[PDB]
Design an enzyme around this catalytic site. Sequence first.
Site, short mmCIF file in Angstrom:
data_model
loop_
_atom_site.label_atom_id
_atom_site.label_comp_id
_atom_site.label_asym_id
_atom_site.label_seq_id
_atom_site.Cartn_x
_atom_site.Cartn_y
_atom_site.Cartn_z
N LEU A 41 0.83 -0.91 0.23
CA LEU A 41 0.00 -0.09 -0.52
C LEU A 41 1.09 1.29 -0.07
CD1 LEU A 41 -2.85 -1.27 2.40
CD2 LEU A 41 -2.61 -1.55 -0.36
N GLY A 48 6.92 3.51 2.85
CA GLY A 48 7.63 5.29 3.52
C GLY A 48 8.88 5.18 3.79
N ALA A 49 8.99 6.13 5.13
CA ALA A 49 10.35 6.08 5.85
C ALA A 49 10.65 5.24 7.30
CB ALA A 49 10.28 7.49 6.14
N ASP A 69 1.01 16.98 10.44
CA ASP A 69 0.85 16.57 9.47
C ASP A 69 -0.39 16.09 8.36
OD1 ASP A 69 3.48 14.19 7.19
OD2 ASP A 69 3.45 16.67 7.15
O1 LIG Z 1 -8.26 0.84 -7.37
C1 LIG Z 1 -8.09 2.47 -7.40
C2 LIG Z 1 -7.39 2.96 -5.82
N1 LIG Z 1 -6.77 1.78 -5.24
C3 LIG Z 1 -4.98 2.49 -5.15
C4 LIG Z 1 -4.70 1.95 -4.07
N2 LIG Z 1 -5.32 2.07 -3.02
C5 LIG Z 1 -4.68 2.16 -1.92
C6 LIG Z 1 -3.39 2.22 -1.59
C7 LIG Z 1 -2.88 2.85 0.02
N3 LIG Z 1 -3.48 2.33 0.98
C8 LIG Z 1 -4.44 2.42 1.11
N4 LIG Z 1 -5.05 2.07 1.83
C9 LIG Z 1 -4.57 2.44 3.03
N5 LIG Z 1 -5.76 1.90 4.03
C10 LIG Z 1 -5.04 2.12 5.74
C11 LIG Z 1 -3.12 2.90 5.22
C12 LIG Z 1 -3.00 2.99 6.33
C13 LIG Z 1 -1.60 3.48 5.88
C14 LIG Z 1 -0.75 4.42 7.42
C15 LIG Z 1 -1.03 3.94 8.26
N6 LIG Z 1 -2.45 4.08 8.60
C16 LIG Z 1 -3.43 3.34 7.67
S1 LIG Z 1 -3.07 2.99 3.92
C17 LIG Z 1 -5.26 2.01 -0.74
C18 LIG Z 1 -7.02 1.34 -2.80
C19 LIG Z 1 -7.32 1.90 -4.07
N7 LIG Z 1 -7.42 2.50 -8.50
C20 LIG Z 1 -8.47 2.91 -9.09
C21 LIG Z 1 -8.21 3.48 -10.19
O2 LIG Z 1 -7.11 3.95 -10.96
C22 LIG Z 1 -5.74 3.39 -9.50
C23 LIG Z 1 -6.10 2.20 -9.23
#
Ligand SMILES: O=C(CN1CCN(c2ccnc(Nc3ncc(-c4cccnc4)s3)c2)CC1)N1CCOCC1
Length: 269
Positions: free
Chosen positions: A14, A17-18, A119
């Site tokens: 997902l 990070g750092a 942040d």
């Molecule tokens: O399915 C998708 C969208 N995606 C893109 C990637 N997605 C992501 C990406 C990154 N993070 C998440 N979800 C997360 N949930 C909790 C997270 C988290 C991270 C750090 C701390 N606390 C919580 S990150 C979800 C899930 C949905 N697309 C359709 C449109 O084109 C781009 C791709």
Amino acid sequence: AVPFVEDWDLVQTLGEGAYGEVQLAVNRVTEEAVAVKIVNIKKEICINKMLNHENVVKFYGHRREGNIQYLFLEYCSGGELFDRIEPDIGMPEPDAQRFFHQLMAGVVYLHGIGITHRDIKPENLLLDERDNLKISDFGLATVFRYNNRERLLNKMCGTLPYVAPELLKRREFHAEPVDVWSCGIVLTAMLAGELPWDQPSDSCQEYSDWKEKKTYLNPWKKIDSAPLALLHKILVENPSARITIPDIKKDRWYNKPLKKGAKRPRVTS
Ligand SMILES: O=C(CN1CCN(c2ccnc(Nc3ncc(-c4cccnc4)s3)c2)CC1)N1CCOCC1
């Protein structure tokens, strides 16, 4: 109780990070999805254990395995607010208003429990399956109120384009107006698809132009007069004169009806 219910498969990255990486974990039995942050850290867990709000990424728990720390957090399937902002365009004003209302709910909550995020930016504002905004990443967060006594901050924290000008100019500063400022920059990004300046310094021509009220320039010319009037109250250099959240909640644009509820199924005749 039920065998294998404690087993999670790490299915996708997902973010890297750092500290380390964030993995999407899927329960072997229930197929429930959680975000696992694989790694400041002791404070992040401590702060996370205090949090319980619909616009704040939920903390499920943590486990230490030698040098590796695992944080089990709410998975937000909608990804980052960052990805909903079209470069140089932004997004429809009703969507930006709804996300702004949700962001204010999360910030009111955090400030109410004496926590400052420090942040806020679209990379840290996540969206669930229903596009509900959730504040994430308490890595830079801190307690600014304890036993009803406010502590002034002095540490340089945050991300330059989002940071309030008092962090760059004063030794000490109140926590709350700093988060209000970053929320204003987020609102600007949602409505114009661009950040107004690299940093809020008089050396930044764009920042000087804003203080001189040159709103005929970008990003300001792309923003309607009602949300722009709110931005004129948030993006005030003097943090003591800056609008507070109770007053943002009274703002004309904040209270303007714009957005229809979620697309619910309907039929005719
Ligand atoms: O399915 C998708 C969208 N995606 C893109 C990637 N997605 C992501 C990406 C990154 N993070 C998440 N979800 C997360 N949930 C909790 C997270 C988290 C991270 C750090 C701390 N606390 C919580 S990150 C979800 C899930 C949905 N697309 C359709 C449109 O084109 C781009 C791709």
